Amino acid sequence: RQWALEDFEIGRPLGKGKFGNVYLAREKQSKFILALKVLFKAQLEKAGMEHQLRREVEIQSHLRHPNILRLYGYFHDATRVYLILEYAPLGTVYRELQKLSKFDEQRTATYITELANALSYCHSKRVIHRDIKPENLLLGSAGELKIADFGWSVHAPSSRRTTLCGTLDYLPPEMIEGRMHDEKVDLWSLGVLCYEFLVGKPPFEANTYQETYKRISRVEFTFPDFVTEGARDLISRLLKHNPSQRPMLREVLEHPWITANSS
Numbered sequence: 001r002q003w004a005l006e007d008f009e010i011g012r013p014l015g016k017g018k019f020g021n022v023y024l025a026r027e028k029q030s031k032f033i034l035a036l037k038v039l040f041k042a043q044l045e046k047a048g049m050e051h052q053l054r055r056e057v058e059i060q061s062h063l064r065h066p067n068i069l070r071l072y073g074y075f076h077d078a079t080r081v082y083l084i085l086e087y088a089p090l091g092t093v094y095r096e097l098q099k100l101s102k103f104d105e106q107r108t109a110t111y112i113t114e115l116a117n118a119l120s121y122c123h124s125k126r127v128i129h130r131d132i133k134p135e136n137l138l139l140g141s142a143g144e145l146k147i148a149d150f151g152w153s154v155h156a157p158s159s160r161r162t163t164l165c166g167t168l169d170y171l172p173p174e175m176i177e178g179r180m181h182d183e184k185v186d187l188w189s190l191g192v193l194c195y196e197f198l199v200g201k202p203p204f205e206a207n208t209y210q211e212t213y214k215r216i217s218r219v220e221f222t223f224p225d226f227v228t229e230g231a232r233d234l235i236s237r238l239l240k241h242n243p244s245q246r247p248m249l250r251e252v253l254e255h256p257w258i259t260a261n262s263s
């Protein structure tokens, strides 16, 4: 309780999503620097995703972890909805990935650690993200990873997927096949990110949706020569077609290659 647009000086655009237009902003009274995610009611309603928005606010407002981005509150005004988010000053892992093409083992292991901790806290409440990918991974002032954008978040188990498009790149077989899914979806994503971080691209990238779908469902990926044995071991363990065969997060955090490299 209980903001209005008038409470904020709006700064520069921080990023655009499918629906979200995100701006740096400062709260006039306190001079608190933050981010406003702006959504258009028309676009949400017409058509599809008004329920995701409610899900995102409800779920994310209630989460408190250093590796999960804060949602502080919200408001609206007949044309738009405004989410008030914690501002992440070092940008997205996506842009960082663009900047240096690929990450070293130390950086990758640290990102995975920070990710595994946030996910393990999420999973502790049976909350599953389902949209873990570099666009949704922000960096705090200490360069620490922060999981963001809970539009796709839901409680486990779930069904449907609803319907998503954009890439399939980060989705496990049980999600691309419309099946019932677990917290295990987030473990598959973790494996996909781990490979993208070291290699510079996702294990199942292809030129078409139909081929990507096929590669994911058949789980066909290969490692460049430069990927080390301990990273190969971790990724092969996360990218298993059968969800239950996938590791618990504790197993990931205690993986030798993770413990060896993680700063």
Ligand SMILES: Nc1ncnc2c1ncn2[C@@H]1O[C@H](COP(=O)(O)OP(=O)(O)O)[C@@H](O)[C@H]1O
Pocket: 014, 015, 016, 017, 018, 019, 020, 021, 022, 035, 037, 069, 085, 086, 087, 088, 089, 091, 092, 135, 136, 138, 148, 149, 151
């Ligand atoms: N709190 C934030 N701090 C800095 N940049 C952000 C923040 N939230 C989002 N962004 C940027 O805006 C983009 C879209 O935000 P997001 O909420 O993920 O979009 P959408 O919900 O529309 O998919 C992100 O990928 C990122 O580049």
Ligand SMILES: [Ca+2]
Pocket: 017, 135, 136, 149
């Ligand atoms: Ca997003």
Ligand SMILES: [Ca+2]
Pocket: 017, 149, 150, 151, 152
């Ligand atoms: Ca979203």
